[PDB]
Amino acid sequence: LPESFDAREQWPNCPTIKEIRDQGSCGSCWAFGAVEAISDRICIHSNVNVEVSAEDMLTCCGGECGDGCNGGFPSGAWNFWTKKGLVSGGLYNSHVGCRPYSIPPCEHHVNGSRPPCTGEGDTPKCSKTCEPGYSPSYKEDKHFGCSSYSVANNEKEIMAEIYKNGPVEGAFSVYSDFLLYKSGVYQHVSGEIMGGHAIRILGWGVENGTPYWLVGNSWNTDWGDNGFFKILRGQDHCGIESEIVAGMPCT
Ligand SMILES: *[C@]1(C(=O)N[C@H](C(=O)N2CCC[C@H]2C(=O)OC)[C@@H](C)CC)O[C@@H]1C(=O)NCCC
């Protein structure tokens, strides 16, 4: 395996890999890490480009994935993709796809022009219909996964999975010092625990002798490094290597 790897550069024909979304004032990271990676993989293994609906995942999976805006289970999300499939749907107010995200973007621990985020956000309804004007129907717009699996807590295996099949979803413990991340390789040194956070791992590298994972967060582009961040790799730091999940699209 190479010393560094950036899925954005390796798969130029898949622009979703470079995208950063905004989960808004809702604990839907579990859903975002999943639909983002799934969007990437649909493109990688179908060379079609689809903005997979975070809304569909968040609202219609149900108990199998956890508790909507109150948190969820990454592996459960990929299961939903293989069982019920996912329709398309872009950013809030984009009118792109069957079910665009319904929760407004906000400022995640940074100052900006958008309203500040509020942890208080209710899970939107599961509506099996597409926005007006969109075709085909909800049922016909479903994209299915044909496998859902969990990658072992093994650096090399995780790198191999990304190298061959594309970005994966992962999760780690977020402490307050992570909230102010701006650059460099993140390593937890202080701060109260905020909770578990699901994200998208799209590569790896070494910065100043420090091995890291290239990760895309779902807190918009003005947080961190243009929406992305790097975290220590190889020591299951904050559990970053302990909950890796992925899957392959049908056909
Ligand atoms: C993962 C999750 O969404 N985490 C939270 C979060 O990202 N936000 C909620 C409101 C807007 C976000 C923010 O800006 O937080 C600062 C927080 C708690 C993480 C830092 O609860 C979700 C998950 O599904 N839980 C289980 C772990 C996989």
Q: In sequence order, what DSSP letters do the residues of 159-175 get, joined into one string? A: HHHHHHH--EEEEEEEE
Q: Are 216 and 227 in contact (CB under 8 A)?
A: yes
**How was this model experimentally determined?**
X-ray
- Residue pair 228/217 in contact (Cβ under 8 Å)? The answer is yes
Residue 111 designated active-site: no
Catalytic, out of 26, 61, 108, 197: 197
Å from CA of 176 to ligand 1 middle: 12
Chain-centre distance for alpha carbon 33? 2
Instruction: Compute CA 22 distance to the chain's CA centroid, rounded to the nearest angstrom.
Output: 10
32 with 61: CB under 8 angstroms? no
Distance (Å, whole) CA 157 – CA 129: 39
Distance separating alpha carbons of residues 250 and 115, to the nearest angstrom: 39
Which token pair is 196? 């578990």
Residue 188 bears catalytic tag: no
How many Å apart are CA 67 and CA 194, to the nearest integer? 17
Task: Write the DSSP string, 4-61.
Answer: -EEHHHH-TT-GGGG---B--SSB-HHHHHHHHHHHHHHHHT------B-HHHHHHHS
Query: Of the residues 60, 69, 98, 217, which is catalytic?
Result: 217
How many angstroms from the chain centroid is the CA of residue 139?
23
From the list 231, 198, 194, 163, the residue with the least C-alpha distance to 73 is: 198
Mutate to test the pocket of ligand 1, among 25, 29, 180, 238 (most ligand atoms within 8 A of CB): 29
- Pairing state between β 185-186 and 210-216: unpaired
Q: Give exposure, 172-201, as e/b (b: 16+ Cβ within 10 Å).
A: bbbbeebeebeeebbebeeeeeeebbbbbb
Q: How many CB atoms lie within 10 A of CB 146?
A: 12
228: three-class secondary structure by DSSP: strand
What the block records as the tokens of 23 is 């989960």
Nominal resolution in Å? 1.9
> What's the gap between Cα 164 and its chain centre?
18
Residue 248 pairs with which residues in a beta bridge?
A: 147
CATH topology for the 1-251 domain: Cathepsin B; Chain A (3.90.70)
Gap between the Cα atoms of 72 and 175, Å rounded: 19
Q: What Cα–Cα distance (Å) separates residue 180 from each residue in 65, 184, 206, 225, 233?
A: 29, 12, 21, 11, 20
Tell me how far apart the alpha carbons of residues 124 and 102 are, in angstroms, rounded to a whole number. 8
CA separation for the pair 7, 11 (Å, rounded) = 6
By alpha-carbon position, which residue is closest to atom 21 of ligand 1? 71
Other CB atoms within 10 Å distance of the CB of residue 156: 10
Cβ-contact 1, 163 below 8 angstroms? yes
Per the annotation, the verdict on 29 as an active-site residue is yes
Quick one: 118 exposed, middle or buried, by C-beta within 10 A (0-12, 13-18, 19+)? exposed
> Shortest CA distance to 5 belongs to which of 136, 123, 184, 165?
165
Of the candidates 231, 218, 245, which has an alpha carbon nearest to the alpha carbon of residue 29? 218
Torsion of CA 173, 108, 95, 136, to 10 degrees: 0
CA distances from 73 to 8, 33, 93 (A): 26, 11, 27
What are the residues whose beta carbons fall under 8 Å from the beta carbon of 26, sequence distance 6 or more?
Answer: 58, 68, 69, 103, 121, 122, 123
DSSP letter, residue 138: T
CA 99 to chain centroid: 17
235 three-state secondary structure: coil
